[PDB]
Amino acid sequence: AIAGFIENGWEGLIDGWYGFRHQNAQGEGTAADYKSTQSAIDQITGKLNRLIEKTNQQFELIDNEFTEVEKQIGNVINWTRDSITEVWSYNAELLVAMENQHTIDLADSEMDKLYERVKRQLRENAEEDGTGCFEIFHKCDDDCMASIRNNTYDHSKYREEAMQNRI
């Protein structure tokens, strides 16, 4: 028996981030979905480009390792630098925390968008099973499974039959 994202992930989905697992008479099968995969990858790549920036500002020695500067000014410099380090350390921590939350949520959201898309192209010809799958109330051969995947499935073709098996 087969299950979807509401239960868990698919360690066996290897050529995509998001995908389809189907079950029919011809057997069982798994295919990746390219657009939703690439959409999540583009978005993450967007973050990387933003956070891999290299600063253009130059800084020079204000201090000396070999011959220590006068104590007063050296303490003021050390306090200034330490305060700045606090700031960057806090920022770095927050940024990563915040972005990770956002990366996680974004990826969920993309799965969500794919599932609610499929739900809609199946119209009245299927029902939600609650694990992230649809029970299709008609025979769906390999070609019919492929038409759902590439978004060409026409629900009216299978309607009268499906509507009936749901009653």
Partner: protein
Amino acid sequence: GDKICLGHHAVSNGTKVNTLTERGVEVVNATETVERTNIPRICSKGKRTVDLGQCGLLGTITGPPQCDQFLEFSADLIIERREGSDVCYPGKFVNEEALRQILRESGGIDKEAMGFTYSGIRTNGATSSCRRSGSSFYAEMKWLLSNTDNAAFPQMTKSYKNTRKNPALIVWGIHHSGSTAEQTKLYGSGNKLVTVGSSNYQQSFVPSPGARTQVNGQSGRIDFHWLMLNPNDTVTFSFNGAFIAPDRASFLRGKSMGIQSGVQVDADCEGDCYYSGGTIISNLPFQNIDSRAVGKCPRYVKQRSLLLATGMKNVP
């Protein structure tokens, strides 16, 4: 019943990261954000590089023996070393670090003669502490003695205009003798004053003769002082002894950066962020290697590691 399921990928052996809400949630993938990796060499490719070694940076202006190669040096990147010394006859610069900071970003220096000449004194002050082929002195300076031992020292004035378009770095010295007896043997009796004025700058100097700790055979000291002389301005030196006079003014060439380091140059690797231990080559926004790193650098942070997620939650 025929069915179609939607799913997402997963792996055994997720990577743990932190979020706003949870510590160590597993994701499918993640990448480091804090650089810890260091190249234990100065990556100088594409940059004229001067390794001062034995020569102290400030010594390039005065010219003790160690600095002979560097009296008119020229560079993009300047490297100071721990063993560097600015002196031969013991002494120090007043405002030393400011002057270092100026020379580190100077591009190097170009030297012009100030054209002083002298009557009724000697000019060949020398010492075993500054040795070339036997006793000698700072190359860019002249140790002015009285004409003979104990003899009186003619009061003198000497000036120099900066006729270039950039400011000129001027340097001179006050000799503080090991005793009053030595001060008199050298410049004669009487008290001794040295007064130095541009227009922009007025200051004054009395020698303090007296016994000090013997530093490379020497009980005396030379105080070095300096100023920037503006374009078209004149500096004038009034004095009657204990004066170590400049022979040459210095002018800054262009732009450079200076570092302090304990590792070799390497012209084959390229870099832009340096520290005492090497060069930090990295596109990461942050680093946990050295807070005093200089150049164009990732921002220094306290933490060893902050992983950034680059995939979804792992639910295996």
